[PDB]
Design a protein around this nucleic acid. Sequence first.
RNA 1: UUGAAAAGCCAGUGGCGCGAAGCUACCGUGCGCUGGAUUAUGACUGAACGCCUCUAAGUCAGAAUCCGGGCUAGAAGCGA
Length: 191
Amino acid sequence: MKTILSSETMDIPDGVNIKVKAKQIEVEGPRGKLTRNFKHLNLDFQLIKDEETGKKKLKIDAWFGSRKTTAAIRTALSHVENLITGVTKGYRYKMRFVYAHFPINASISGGNKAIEIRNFLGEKRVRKVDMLEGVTVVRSEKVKDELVLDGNDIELVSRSAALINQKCHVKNKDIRKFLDGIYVSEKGRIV
RNA sequence: UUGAAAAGCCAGUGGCGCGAAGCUACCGUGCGCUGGAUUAUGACUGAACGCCUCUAAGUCAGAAUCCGGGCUAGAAGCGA
Ligand SMILES: [K+]
């Protein structure tokens, strides 16, 4: 019914520098740089500075927006929160090999930017997956048959994990019985 | 049949054997192709709805599919 004003605000930690211009949000922190283009959202992004204290706040509001339009405010706020978390602490995804008979052989290429799977269900085909920008994959030593994906962008790390998972789908078999694959087992922060 | 021999001719291709050349047969030989976008589907982040959610905004993989490329033609189209 076109609510007059829907508004939400988030606090910005002092250790992160943020810039907003034409719905283009730049996020800066010790771990690096992250960028996002929110031009597709018909919202008003404002950065509020408290002169006495100096803490930052990001306010996103929609004027005369419907429920569908208003649903994007929290989405944008969560995206900005994810950017802050990635630039301060980083993101760490953990994947585990599951197999019944044929152990899965993983070969990390140079730079920890690609992986090779060779013995999935005793298959002679070699599966190739390339890590996305800013995401590295390493073989865990303390945990048996575990892959660790680290990066600054949550979306890129999660998409790399999804690519690894989907590259090892079982076919022409009852997947309930044939449970072999590589699956995400834990989502966390590097720091 | 030309007197004979030799050498030809006539029987609309006299008939038979072999027959080069050209034509020609899966009856012979050679060749027949790869970038993008996506369907179904499976997913990422993510609200609505403090949780959840492939979906609402945004995003990914994806086919004997579509488009392009390649191949054939080349317009009251055109260049040097
Ligand atoms: K989800």
